[PDB]
């Protein structure tokens, strides 16, 4: 009930009641926020509401203080005193305030119902605590929106890859894939019982989960909305290039995992943070593995953003680093348990930001910056307080599932504070070495966003195919379908024998489900499917609208396949920019 206000940092006792997160407001700030905005409720050690029996007023500018309680105009005693006066609300530490002038932007942040692009513009354009508050309230409103959904009434199950499941009345079908996790809890007689961490395929219900339970009666599948804890640390800590390498020990020998990893260490050893600006399959994986043994006496942390993207997080660590030096952190969902759980002392911890064993370090690595918000940066900076760290990830990737915005797409400058921090002043690191890839992605993404700092390592045989087909779009439900995909898969496998074992990018997951039901291709997620790409992939049409195709969803999709990248021109794409081979359908 006592703390610092979000603007003056002065001691206060007043909580605003019309903001969903109940921030701590300074008395002058409270007056400014209650006058210039329809936020007319204030909370103190006791609520600022009329206590007259039978009365109901919840204003602040309307109440009068009398005796010991608070009263209104209709019940003010002869000894009365208005609470809202002198442009300053009545509360503790009223004489030790300083006020602030950043009230209009704070009002806009509070009043912004998160509708248009300017919402995120001003979310990313403010002072530190306002960034924290905006991120917190954005996650709060999105989780309230997703919890405003029904309960999956289930009473029986057909079999594996089949399910009958019913939502509530007046509630629509929730979003489809693992980006919106389905984790429910049924009841037997008196309490809740376990169901399983799952996700649904289509509407036939195949299971893309990782378990199988005796599912039938009284089953409650829900997208579990979690209470959000308040933030402590800022989104980033301002760096300063050291002169002493404190704690860091360049070994006598050279652990030559990679050649340029020496320079890696050379400039990541002095600044309080760094970032691994990695194009797909371009050293985005094991530079930290080399750092593991070149700096073996340094406490090194590894993390990502989702439990799905732990492939390179967990493989080479056990593959080449010593067995004992690794450590595992997993809540107990289904993920790689290759290292040791329940071990506090170790130098190489591998996990996600979901849950860690609270400790501090001096070296951290952090993956998947593209779908990372300032909330995740703040929580990783709070849980881990290190000396240097790297944010693995590239702007030429996919945004976080910000379904909140509908009008304007969220561009690289609006991913998070760090993702534009390396955009304005330049990246901490810039690689130009593709591990295993022909120069198609080189040409494409170097003309688009890589600025041609990486060039042809593998030859361009021009086996990849792009055609003149356009496609037709039709909406049914929150997922759509494509007749010039139900026919187009067959029309494109007519005689070409090379893309029969390709992977299916899924702008619409229901369309991929129908393709699997009819012809059959593996389902490939869009956002959380980096590093899971095979050697051979089809980029399908699947859409023409502003769902996916402005710039930054295909920058990684062009790199899914290595030699045979069938990226047909679907819609208002970057057609007249390069050279691409084509075959005309009969």
């Amino acid at each position: 009930a006592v703390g610092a206000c979000v603007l003056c940092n002065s001691q206060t006792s007043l909580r605003c009641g019309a903001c969903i997160r109940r921030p701590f407001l300074c008395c002058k700030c409270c007056y400014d926020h209650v006058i210039s905005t329809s936020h007319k409720l204030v909370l103190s050690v006791n609520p600022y509401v009329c206590n007259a029996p039978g009365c109901d007023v919840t204003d602040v500018t309307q109440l009068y203080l009398g005796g010991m309680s608070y009263y209104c105009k209709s019940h003010k005693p002869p000894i009365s005193f208005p609470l809202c006066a002198n442009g300053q609300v009545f509360g503790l530490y009223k004489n030790t305030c300083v006020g602030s002038d950043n009230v209009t932007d704070f009002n806009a942040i509070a009043t912004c119902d998160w509708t248009n692009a300017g919402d995120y513009i001003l979310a990313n354009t403010c002072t530190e605590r306002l960034k924290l508050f905006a991120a917190e309230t954005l996650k709060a409103t999105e989780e309230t929106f997703k919890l405003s959904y029904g309960i999956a009434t289930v009473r029986e199950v057909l079999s594996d890859r089949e399910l009958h499941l019913s939502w509530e009345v007046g509630k629509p079908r929730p979003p489809l894939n693992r980006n919106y996790v389905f984790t429910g809890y049924r009841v037997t007689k008196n309490s809740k019982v376990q169901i399983g961490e799952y996700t649904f395929e289509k509407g036939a219900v195949v299971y893309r989960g990782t378990t199988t339970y005796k599912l039938n009666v009284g089953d409650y599948f829900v997208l579990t909305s979690h209470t959000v804890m308040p933030l402590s640390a800022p989104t980033l800590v301002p760096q300063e290039h050291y002169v002493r390498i404190t704690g860091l020990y360049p070994t006598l020998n050279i652990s030559d995992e990679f050649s340029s990893n020496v320079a890696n260490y050379q400039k990541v050893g002095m600044q309080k943070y760094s970032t691994l600006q990695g194009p797909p399959g371009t050293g985005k994986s094991h530079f930290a593995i080399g750092l593991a043994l070149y700096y073996p006496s340094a406490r090194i942390v590894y993390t990502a953003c989702s439990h799905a993207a732990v492939d390179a997080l967990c493989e080479k660590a056990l593959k080449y680093l010593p067995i004992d030096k690794c450590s595992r952190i997993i809540p107990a969902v289904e993920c790689f348990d290759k290292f040791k759980v329940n071990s506090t002392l170790e130098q190489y911890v591998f996990c996600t930001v979901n849950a860690l064993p609270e400790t501090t370090a001096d070296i951290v690595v952090f993956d998947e910056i593209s779908m990372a918000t300032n909330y995740d940066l703040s929580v990783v900076n709070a849980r881990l307080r290190a000396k240097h760290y790297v944010y693995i990830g590239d702007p030429a990737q996919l945004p976080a599932p910000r379904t909140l915005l509908t009008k304007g797409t969220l561009e690289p400058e609006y991913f998070n504070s760090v993702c534009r921090l390396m955009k304005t002043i330049g990246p901490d690191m810039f690689l130009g070495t593709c591990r295993r890839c022909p120069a198609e992605i080189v040409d494409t993404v170097s003309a688009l966003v890589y600025d041609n700092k990486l060039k042809a390592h593998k030859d361009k045989s021009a086996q990849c195919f792009k055609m003149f087909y356009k496609g037709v779009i039709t909406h049914d439900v929150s997922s759509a379908i494509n007749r010039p995909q139900i026919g187009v898969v067959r029309e494109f496998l007519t005689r070409n024998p090379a893309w029969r074992k390709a992977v299916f990018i899924s702008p619409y997951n229901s369309q991929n489900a129908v393709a699997s039901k009819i012809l059959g291709l593996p389902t490939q997620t869009v956002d959380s499917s980096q590093g899971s790409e095979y050697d051979y992939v089809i980029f399908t049409q699947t859409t023409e609208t502003a769902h996916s195709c402005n710039v930054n969803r295909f920058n990684v999709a062009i790199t899914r396949a290595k030699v045979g990248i069938l990226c047909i021109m679907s819609d208002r794409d970057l057609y007249d920019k390069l050279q691409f081979t084509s075959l005309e359908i009969p």
């Binding site: 009930a1 006792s13 103190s44 050690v45 006791n46 010991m68 000894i79 009545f90 503790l92």
Partner: protein, 190 residues
């Protein structure tokens, strides 16, 4: 107390009236002076009293709310302390012998007086004199409560180590006699 809303009017009227008095005018101006100043002071009176009442009311309200906040902080810290104590004392329950004797009960309920008697790992004995000592814990291992215990340490009333070689009949009057013997369960728990 000097910039009240009625202060300007009262002071200006007083100054004008006293200037008129210093002008040496007739008695009518003096009567008007007296009436105006009397009513001016009368109206200043309540404006000087009600404000002083209100300030003290506000100060009392502030003090009460401050003490309420302090009480809430103290409650939070005592709750944290109690939770910590409970979760700390939880970690010594020996959850295999306790489970073994709980499951034998016909409904899950057992007397509290037989839990330390059958699941404890350490035993402490307080001995008044040597005659009682030689009948209870003579030697290095003794039997009590249908179990076998072996001695681990012996101290005296001053908490100083005592070796069993000097607990004899002749040397008895040279010890702080409220001796405390510590033993471990043999073959069972510690």
């Amino acid at each position: 107390f000097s910039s009240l809303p009625s202060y300007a009017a009262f002071a200006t009227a007083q100054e004008a009236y006293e200037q008129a008095v210093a002008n040496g005018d007739s008695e009518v101006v003096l009567k008007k002076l007296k009436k105006s100043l009397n009513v001016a002071k009368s109206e200043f009176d309540r404006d000087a009293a009600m404000q002083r009442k209100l300030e003290k009311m506000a100060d009392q309200a502030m003090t009460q709310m401050y003490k309420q906040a302090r009480s809430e902080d103290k409650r939070a810290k005592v709750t944290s302390a109690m939770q910590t104590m409970l979760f700390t004392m939880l970690r010594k329950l020996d959850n295999d012998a306790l489970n073994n004797i709980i499951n034998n009960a016909r409904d899950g309920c057992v007397p509290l007086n037989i839990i330390p008697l059958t699941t404890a790992a350490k035993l402490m004995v307080v001995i008044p004199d040597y005659n009682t000592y030689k009948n209870t814990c003579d030697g290095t291992t003794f039997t009590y409560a249908s179990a076998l215990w072996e001695i681990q340490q012996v101290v005296d009333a001053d908490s100083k180590i005592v070796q069993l070689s000097e607990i004899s009949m002749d040397n008895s009057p040279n010890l702080a006699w409220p001796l405390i013997v510590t033993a471990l369960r043999a073959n069972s728990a510690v």
